[PDB]
Design a protein around this motif. Structure first.
Motif, PDB file in Angstrom:
ATOM      1  N   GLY A  25      73.307  49.973  27.828  1.00  0.00           N
ATOM      2  CA  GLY A  25      74.004  50.049  26.307  1.00  0.00           C
ATOM      3  C   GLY A  25      73.136  49.328  25.392  1.00  0.00           C
ATOM      4  N   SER A  26      71.881  48.874  25.667  1.00  0.00           N
ATOM      5  CA  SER A  26      70.913  48.507  24.859  1.00  0.00           C
ATOM      6  C   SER A  26      69.555  49.251  25.199  1.00  0.00           C
ATOM      7  N   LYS A  27      69.084  49.878  23.922  1.00  0.00           N
ATOM      8  CA  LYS A  27      67.691  50.651  24.134  1.00  0.00           C
ATOM      9  C   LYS A  27      66.508  49.288  24.411  1.00  0.00           C
ATOM     10  N   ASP A  28      66.830  48.389  23.979  1.00  0.00           N
ATOM     11  CA  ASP A  28      65.889  47.161  24.222  1.00  0.00           C
ATOM     12  C   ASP A  28      65.712  46.719  25.746  1.00  0.00           C
ATOM     13  N   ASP A  29      66.752  47.233  26.576  1.00  0.00           N
ATOM     14  CA  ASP A  29      66.867  46.691  27.824  1.00  0.00           C
ATOM     15  C   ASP A  29      66.306  48.104  28.721  1.00  0.00           C
ATOM     16  N   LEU A  30      65.855  49.196  27.992  1.00  0.00           N
ATOM     17  CA  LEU A  30      65.202  50.178  28.862  1.00  0.00           C
ATOM     18  C   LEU A  30      64.034  49.687  29.621  1.00  0.00           C
ATOM     19  N   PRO A  31      63.972  50.303  30.875  1.00  0.00           N
ATOM     20  CA  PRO A  31      62.881  49.959  31.608  1.00  0.00           C
ATOM     21  C   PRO A  31      61.511  50.300  31.134  1.00  0.00           C
ATOM     22  N   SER A  32      60.542  49.607  31.088  1.00  0.00           N
ATOM     23  CA  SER A  32      59.258  50.197  30.423  1.00  0.00           C
ATOM     24  C   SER A  32      58.859  51.269  30.774  1.00  0.00           C
ATOM     25  N   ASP A  33      57.868  51.972  29.899  1.00  0.00           N
ATOM     26  CA  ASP A  33      57.575  53.377  30.077  1.00  0.00           C
ATOM     27  C   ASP A  33      56.913  53.571  31.386  1.00  0.00           C
ATOM     28  N   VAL A  34      56.083  52.617  31.850  1.00  0.00           N
ATOM     29  CA  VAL A  34      55.626  52.413  33.040  1.00  0.00           C
ATOM     30  C   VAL A  34      56.436  53.003  34.154  1.00  0.00           C
ATOM     31  N   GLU A  35      57.706  52.140  34.258  1.00  0.00           N
ATOM     32  CA  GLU A  35      58.603  52.212  35.283  1.00  0.00           C
ATOM     33  C   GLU A  35      59.382  53.604  35.117  1.00  0.00           C
ATOM     34  N   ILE A  36      59.525  54.090  33.682  1.00  0.00           N
ATOM     35  CA  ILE A  36      60.089  55.337  33.497  1.00  0.00           C
ATOM     36  C   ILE A  36      59.426  56.652  34.253  1.00  0.00           C
ATOM     37  N   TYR A  37      58.031  56.532  33.751  1.00  0.00           N
ATOM     38  CA  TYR A  37      57.030  57.618  34.617  1.00  0.00           C
ATOM     39  C   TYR A  37      57.043  57.519  35.900  1.00  0.00           C
ATOM     40  N   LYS A  38      57.126  56.402  36.689  1.00  0.00           N
ATOM     41  CA  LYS A  38      57.232  56.178  37.991  1.00  0.00           C
ATOM     42  C   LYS A  38      58.372  56.691  38.581  1.00  0.00           C
ATOM     43  N   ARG A  39      59.739  56.618  37.868  1.00  0.00           N
ATOM     44  CA  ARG A  39      60.841  57.005  38.335  1.00  0.00           C
ATOM     45  C   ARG A  39      60.783  58.761  38.355  1.00  0.00           C
ATOM     46  N   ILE A  40      60.274  59.270  37.131  1.00  0.00           N
ATOM     47  CA  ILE A  40      60.155  60.767  36.935  1.00  0.00           C
ATOM     48  C   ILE A  40      59.345  61.122  38.113  1.00  0.00           C
ATOM     49  N   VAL A  41      58.415  60.557  38.539  1.00  0.00           N
ATOM     50  CA  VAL A  41      57.252  61.108  39.787  1.00  0.00           C
ATOM     51  C   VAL A  41      58.291  61.117  40.822  1.00  0.00           C
ATOM     52  N   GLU A  42      58.961  60.097  41.408  1.00  0.00           N
ATOM     53  CA  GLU A  42      59.886  60.086  42.546  1.00  0.00           C
ATOM     54  C   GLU A  42      61.015  61.045  42.422  1.00  0.00           C
ATOM     55  N   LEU A  43      61.455  61.534  41.402  1.00  0.00           N
ATOM     56  CA  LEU A  43      62.501  62.417  41.237  1.00  0.00           C
ATOM     57  C   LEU A  43      61.840  63.926  41.214  1.00  0.00           C
ATOM     58  N   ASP A  63      67.916  53.257  15.323  1.00  0.00           N
ATOM     59  CA  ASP A  63      66.725  52.630  15.046  1.00  0.00           C
ATOM     60  C   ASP A  63      65.488  53.282  15.547  1.00  0.00           C
ATOM     61  N   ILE A  64      65.770  54.723  15.685  1.00  0.00           N
ATOM     62  CA  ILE A  64      64.845  55.596  16.158  1.00  0.00           C
ATOM     63  C   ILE A  64      63.343  55.752  15.485  1.00  0.00           C
ATOM     64  N   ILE A  65      63.315  55.455  14.107  1.00  0.00           N
ATOM     65  CA  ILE A  65      62.282  55.810  13.396  1.00  0.00           C
ATOM     66  C   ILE A  65      61.088  54.905  13.941  1.00  0.00           C
ATOM     67  N   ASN A  66      61.720  53.647  14.438  1.00  0.00           N
ATOM     68  CA  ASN A  66      60.974  52.454  15.100  1.00  0.00           C
ATOM     69  C   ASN A  66      60.704  52.450  16.728  1.00  0.00           C
ATOM     70  N   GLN A  67      61.231  53.307  16.954  1.00  0.00           N
ATOM     71  CA  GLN A  67      61.079  53.555  18.653  1.00  0.00           C
ATOM     72  C   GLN A  67      60.384  54.825  18.879  1.00  0.00           C
ATOM     73  N   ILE A  68      59.728  55.525  18.092  1.00  0.00           N
ATOM     74  CA  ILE A  68      58.852  56.681  18.396  1.00  0.00           C
ATOM     75  C   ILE A  68      57.339  56.191  18.891  1.00  0.00           C
ATOM     76  N   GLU A  69      56.748  55.265  18.169  1.00  0.00           N
ATOM     77  CA  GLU A  69      55.554  54.898  18.357  1.00  0.00           C
ATOM     78  C   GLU A  69      55.530  54.099  19.785  1.00  0.00           C
ATOM     79  N   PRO A  70      56.336  53.510  20.121  1.00  0.00           N
ATOM     80  CA  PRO A  70      56.162  52.366  21.555  1.00  0.00           C
ATOM     81  C   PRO A  70      56.385  53.550  22.582  1.00  0.00           C
ATOM     82  N   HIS A  71      56.883  54.769  22.469  1.00  0.00           N
ATOM     83  CA  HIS A  71      57.017  55.639  23.583  1.00  0.00           C
ATOM     84  C   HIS A  71      55.974  57.016  23.181  1.00  0.00           C
TER      85      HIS A  71
END
Length: 169
Positions: A25-43, A63-71
């Motif tokens: 329920g919180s985009k702050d608590d998303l797994p890091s992009d590192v972990e996300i890409y690792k998950r993508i590779v496993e799947l 808050d999407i305007i502020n969430q583009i750069e980190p990803h």
């Protein structure tokens, strides 16, 4: 979907469900992009455009305007300069604005400008997208409403085209 038009779960829905479950329920608590890409590779979905359709629906909130750069790193890597992958991300964003956060629909020109400025979606893809309506991601009237709101930015790109034309001697 939940990440698409279909009713039953496919592997991309599972990926999306996982991200939502992890973030809880919180985009702050998303797994890091590192972990996300690792998950993508496993799947086994690093080479499938639909992954970007999922990311466009789960990575961002009001808050999407502020969430583009980190990803940026994660999205560029998956897109890999490929137009069909750009269109999939746009398909995910269309579901996001159209079905999830319609309150952001007036901010669409500014938000897409942000994807553009970071080389995530090309001008050519944006102009074509903004000039059609589709039932591939959302109902066509929803598609019309979303893409209509993008028209100021689409026009901007169209008018900026000539001055950006490559010039020599």
């Amino acid at each position: 979907g939940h990440m698409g038009l279909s009713v039953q779960n496919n592997k991309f829905d599972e990926f999306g469900e996982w991200l939502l479950k992890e973030s809880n329920g919180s985009k702050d608590d998303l797994p890091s992009d590192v972990e996300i890409y690792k998950r993508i590779v496993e799947l086994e979905i690093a080479d499938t455009p639909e992954t970007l359709q999922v990311l466009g629906q789960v990575l961002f909130d009001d808050d999407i305007i502020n969430q583009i750069e980190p990803h940026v790193g994660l999205l560029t890597k998956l897109i890999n300069g490929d137009e069909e992958f750009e269109k999939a991300l746009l398909g995910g964003l269309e579901r996001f604005f159209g079905l999830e956060k319609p309150n952001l629909i007036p901010q669409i020109p500014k938000i897409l400008h942000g994807f553009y400025d970071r080389d995530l979606i090309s001008e050519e893809v944006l102009i074509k997208w903004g000039s059609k309506v589709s039932k591939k991601y959302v109902p066509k009237d929803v598609s019309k409403k979303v893409r209509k709101a993008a028209k100021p930015f689409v026009k901007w790109l169209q008018e900026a085209e000539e001055e950006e034309e490559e010039e020599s001697d």
